[PDB]
Structures are given as structure tokens and as C-alpha cells.
Amino acid sequence: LKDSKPELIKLYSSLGKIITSSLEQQEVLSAVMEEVRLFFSPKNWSLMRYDENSEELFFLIAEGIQFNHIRSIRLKSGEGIAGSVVQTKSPIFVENVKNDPRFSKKVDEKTGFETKTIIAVPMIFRGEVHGVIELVNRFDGSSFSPEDLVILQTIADFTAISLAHSDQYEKTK
Amino acid sequence: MTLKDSKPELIKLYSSLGKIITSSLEQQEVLSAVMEEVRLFFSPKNWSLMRYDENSEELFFLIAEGIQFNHIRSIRLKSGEGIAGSVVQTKSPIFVENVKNDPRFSKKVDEKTGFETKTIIAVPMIFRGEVHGVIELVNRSFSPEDLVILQTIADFTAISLAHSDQYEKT
Ligand SMILES: Nc1ncnc2c1ncn2[C@@H]1O[C@@H]2COP(=O)(O)O[C@H]2[C@H]1O
Ligand SMILES: Nc1ncnc2c1ncn2[C@@H]1O[C@@H]2COP(=O)(O)O[C@H]2[C@H]1O
Numbered sequence: 198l199k200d201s202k203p204e205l206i207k208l209y210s211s212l213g214k215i216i217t218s219s220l221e222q223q224e225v226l227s228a229v230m231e232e233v234r235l236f237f238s239p240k241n242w243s244l245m246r247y248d249e250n251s252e253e254l255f256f257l258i259a260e261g262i263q264f265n266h267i268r269s270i271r272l273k274s275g276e277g278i279a280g281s282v283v284q285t286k287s288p289i290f291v292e293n294v295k296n297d298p299r300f301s302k303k304v305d306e307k308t309g310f311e312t313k314t315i316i317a318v319p320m321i322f323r324g325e326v327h328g329v330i331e332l333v334n335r336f337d338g339s340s341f342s343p344e345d346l347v348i349l350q351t352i353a354d355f356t357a358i359s360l361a362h363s364d365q366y367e368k369t370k
Numbered sequence: 371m372t373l374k375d376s377k378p379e380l381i382k383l384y385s386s387l388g389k390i391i392t393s394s395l396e397q398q399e400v401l402s403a404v405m406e407e408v409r410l411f412f413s414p415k416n417w418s419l420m421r422y423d424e425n426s427e428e429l430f431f432l433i434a435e436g437i438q439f440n441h442i443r444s445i446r447l448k449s450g451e452g453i454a455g456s457v458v459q460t461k462s463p464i465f466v467e468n469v470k471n472d473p474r475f476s477k478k479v480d481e482k483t484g485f486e487t488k489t490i491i492a493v494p495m496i497f498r499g500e501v502h503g504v505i506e507l508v509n510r511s512f513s514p515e516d517l518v519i520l521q522t523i524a525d526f527t528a529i530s531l532a533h534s535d536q537y538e539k540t
Binding site (some may be wrong): 365 | 395520526
């Protein structure tokens with residue numbers, strides 16, 4: 198079936214195994230891509246890292262848009278759905294970004310993509326926010342399940358662990 | 371959203387094992403995290419974690435509960451030696467209901483400890499497709515769910531120990 202419990206627990210217990218398998222940031226980022234693709238195959242999704250010093254978010258991963266167009270983007274805290282996730286430390290689901298004042302058009306203006314829906318989750322490790330993962334125009338009010346949310350939160354949890362350790366390993370070297 | 375089934379809780383449970391075990395880069399904390407999870411899920415009076423040294427192709431003990439560590443500190447198992455050594459070679463779990471009827475069994479440790487081994491469940495610690503060690507539950511049936519939990523502990527412990535080694539080189 199793959200809906201049977203034995204298959205579900207195999208799948209759920211595989212989470213994190215690719216993501217946590219390297220200390221080097223590039224390999225972590227590739228691994229995150231692999232697990233996100235496996236569970237969601239999103240045409241548009243991203244991972245934004247939070248810089249504690251500048252209090253800004255920047256892109257590390259941005260699938261379905263041109264990385265060159267968004268390399269220079271920095272979001273201030275509270276800016277965008279992604280910025281609000283950092284502040285609230287909680288997920289945000291938005292069925293239509295026009296109807297949300299928190300939304301930031303900045304990136305759509307650079308890319309010419311039109312954002313309609315966002316699920317955004319915080320990456321938290323030991324109480325610190327390391328960033329945000331967004332799935333863009335992937336889900337709407339009907340298709341977004343509690344299981345989807347938990348799977349995505351779990352990916353974000355393991356990614357936080359791996360990125361924290363990658364940073365700490367870089368320092369000592 | 372309103373909940374229709376227990377999937378969210380299943381995901382949180384199965385993925386908690388790896389979040390706990392991988393959270394530290396210091397070996398002692400990793401080992402303590404492993405002990406915590408193994409004790410919680412299985413409460414074994416006798417169990418162990420043996421690390422595989424790629425260079426010497428030997429297994430040695432990092433954890434050995436229910437026997438005196440001072441008796442087994444020097445033990446080294448060659449590849450293929452013991453149930454544990456066979457797991458390394460086959461890269462698969464081995465269940466043995468009675469070690470007297472298994473030619474793979476190694477008496478070497480019982481001889482040092484004076485403990486009598488009767489049953490073993492042994493699981494490989496897999497990292498990037500290779501075996502980095504073995505976890506044994508000794509003298510105490512084993513459901514498919516138990517197996518998955520143990521295998522998950524094993525795999526994440528390989529991941530976490532590899533990183534702890536790489537980090538501690540500094
Ligand atoms: N992979 C992506 N493809 C297209 N647009 C994206 C992607 N990731 C982020 N965005 C957009 O970037 C915006 C950043 O601020 P918001 O989170 O408020 O809304 C976000 C989306 O509109
Ligand atoms: N925690 C333990 N308590 C007692 N004996 C153990 C423990 N862990 C491993 N052993 C023994 O160590 C032996 C190593 O070789 P085997 O795997 O064939 O069989 C193993 C057991 O007999």
C-alpha cells in the first residue's frame with residue numbers, strides 16, 4: 198500500500214538521515230533538497246538562513262526561480278512571511294498572499310514569478326532560529342494536511358541541527 | 371487544522387530518535403543520548419554498542435551495559451568474528467535464539483566476563499551504505515516495529531559518531 202503502518206514508519210524514520218549525514222554546508226543543502234523533493238516534489242520552494250547579527254534572512258536554496266535574481270535579497274526581521282516566522286517562531290500558512298499584509302513582494306518583483314500560497318516553517322535548534330523553509334504555490338486550503346505540516350517541520354528541525362553543526366565545524370578548522 | 375488520525379504523532383515519534391541522538395557533536399553526549407533511547411524503548415539488562423574501526427577492520431566496545439567494562443575494554447573482534455562480526459560482513463541484522471547452535475558465535479567475551487550469552491539481537495549501524503558498528507541486545511518476541519526502532523537508533527548513532535569523530539579531530 199505505502200499507506201500501511203509498516204511503510205509509514207519506515208518512511209518517517211528515514212527523515213533526517215540524508216540531511217544529518219554531512220558537516221559541510223553544501224552537502225547539507227543538497228541533502229535537504231533530496232528529502233524535500235522526496236516528500237513534496239515542489240516546483241517552487243526555498244531555504245533561507247537567518248543571520249543573528251544583521252537580523253536578516255538570505256537565500257541558500259531557491260528552486261523554481263533563478264538564483265542570480267535573488268542572491269542579493271536580504272529580508273529584515275518581521276519582513277515578509279518568512280520574516281514573521283522568525284519573529285513568531287511558528288509556522289505560517291497563507292492561502293492567498295494578497296490577503297496578507299505580512300507578505301513581501303520584493304522577490305516576486307525581482308523574479309517575475311507570482312506567489313499565491315506559502316507554507317513557511319521555522320528552523321529551530323536549541324531555541325535559536327536558524328532560518329525558514331518555504332513551499333510556494335504547492336498547497337492550498339484543501340490540500341494541506343496536518344501530516345504535511347509535521348513532515349515539513351521535522352525536515353526543518355533536522356536541517357537546523359545540521360546547519361548549526363556545520364557552522365560550529367567551520368569555526369574549528 | 372482538525373485531526374483525523376494519529377499520523378502526526380507517528381511522525382514525531384519515529385523522527386524523535388534521530389533528533390535526540392544527532393543533537394550533540396561530543397561523543398559522551400551522543401553515547402548518553404543512545405543509552406537513553408535504548409533504555410526507554412527496550413530496557414535491556416545486557417546490551418552493547420561496538421564501533422567498527424575501518425583501518426584495523428575490528429570491532430571494539432563503546433558501551434557495554436550489564437557487564438564490567440574493565441573486563442572487555444581490550445576485546446577486538448576481527449571482521450566475520452562473532453555474531454557482531456558477521457553483521458558487519460552481511461550488513462544485515464542477525465537474530466539468534468540460542469548461541470550454542472550458531473557457529474558464528476564468539477565465546478571470547480563470555481570467557482572474560484563469566485556471563486553466559488544465550489540470545490542475541492544484533493543490528494548494523496549503517497552510514498552511507500557501510501557498517502560503522504553494531505548494537506546488540508543480549509538475553510532478552512521482537513516485533514517488526516522494535517526492529518525499525520532499533521535500526522533507526524543504529525543508523526543515527528553511526529551518523530552522529532562519525533561527525534563527533536570528525537569534530538573531535540580539532
Ligand atoms: N522557490 C521560490 N520560488 C518563487 N518565489 C519564492 C520562492 N521562495 C520564496 N519566494 C518568494 O519570496 C518571498 C519572500 O518573502 P515572503 O515570505 O513574504 O514571500 C516569499 C515568496 O513570495
Ligand atoms: N552487554 C553485554 N553483556 C554480556 N555479553 C555481551 C554484551 N554485549 C556483547 N556481549 C557478548 O559479546 C560477544 C561478542 O561476540 P558475539 O557477537 O558472537 O556474542 C557477544 C556476546 O556474547
